[PDB]
């Protein structure tokens, strides 16, 4: 009973979380997952500031109100070569990665590793935070509050 959460650097408190190496997070699960990191879904303004500090990914993820990809450099296979906060317009499907915003993180680029999941609750799952440099932090718990997400 295990969940892997791959996380990035934070940029003005915003970071990306990919669950189990595939698009697998619902909008309700995303809010609960950010809450376990003492974080919230970013606002579009928070995401635009993160972008300006150096944040980009090549994966769709929830923010408040939309599903987006922050892009700095044009790449043909990432958001159809767009730059800026690219907003997903048309999709049949509902499951993506998520972004999260931690207000207590540093104001600019923070590429230190994530070493805690401070607000998860009691439960049976082994949750492992996997950093880009491979360092890992694991704890037994749960973060999903909606049974349909379990
Ligand atoms: C200690 C710090 N690197 C950390 O582990 N966190 C803050 C950044 C967002 C997620 C997590 C709560």
UniProtKB/Swiss-Prot annotation:
Residues of this chain annotated as glycosylated in UniProt: 6, 38, 81, 92, 102
Covalent S-S links between cysteines: 9-111, 34-100, 58-78
Highest taxon of source: Eukaryota
Residues of the Link domain: 13-102
Post-translational modification: N-glycosylated.
Subcellular location field: Cell membrane; Cell projection, Microvillus; Secreted
Residues that coordinate or bind hyaluronan: 22, 59-60, 86
Tissue specificity as recorded in UniProt: Expressed in the intestinal epithelium.
Main function: Cell-surface receptor that plays a role in cell-cell interactions, cell adhesion and migration, helping them to sense and respond to changes in the tissue microenvironment. Participates thereby in a wide variety of cellular functions including the activation, recirculation and homing of T-lymphocytes, hematopoiesis, inflammation and response to bacterial infection.
Binding partners and assembly: Interacts with PKN2. Interacts with TIAM1 and TIAM2. Interacts with HA, as well as other glycosaminoglycans, collagen, laminin, and fibronectin via its N-terminal segment. Interacts with UNC119. Interacts with PDPN (via extracellular domain); this interaction is required for PDPN-mediated directional migration and regulation of lamellipodia extension/stabilization during cell spreading and migration. Interacts with RDX, EZR and MSN (via FERM domain). Interacts with EGFR. Interacts with CD74; this complex is essential for the MIF-induced signaling cascade that results in B cell survival.
Comment field on protein domains: The lectin-like LINK domain is responsible for hyaluronan binding.
Name of the molecule in the record: CD44 antigen
Species annotation: Mus musculus (Mouse)
Taxonomic lineage of the native organism: Eukaryota, Metazoa, Chordata, Craniata, Vertebrata
Gene name of this polypeptide: Cd44
């Amino acid at each position: 009973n295990q969940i892997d959460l791959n996380v990035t650097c934070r940029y003005a408190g915003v970071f990306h979380v990919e669950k189990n190496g595939r698009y697998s997070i619902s909008r309700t699960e995303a809010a609960d997952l950010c809450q376990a990191f003492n974080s919230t879904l970013p606002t579009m303004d928070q995401m635009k500031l993160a972008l300006s500090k150096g944040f980009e990914t090549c994966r769709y993820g929830f923010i408040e109100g939309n599903v987006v990809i922050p892009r700095i450099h044009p790449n043909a296979i990432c958001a159809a070569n767009h730059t800026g906060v690219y907003i997903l317009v048309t999709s049949n499907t509902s499951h993506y990665d998520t972004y999260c915003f931690n207000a207590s993180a540093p104001p600019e680029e923070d590429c230190t590793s994530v070493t805690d999941l401070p607000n998860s609750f009691d439960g049976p799952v082994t949750i492992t935070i996997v950093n880009r440099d491979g360092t890992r932090y694991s704890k037994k718990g749960e973060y999903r509050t909606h049974q349909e997400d379990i």
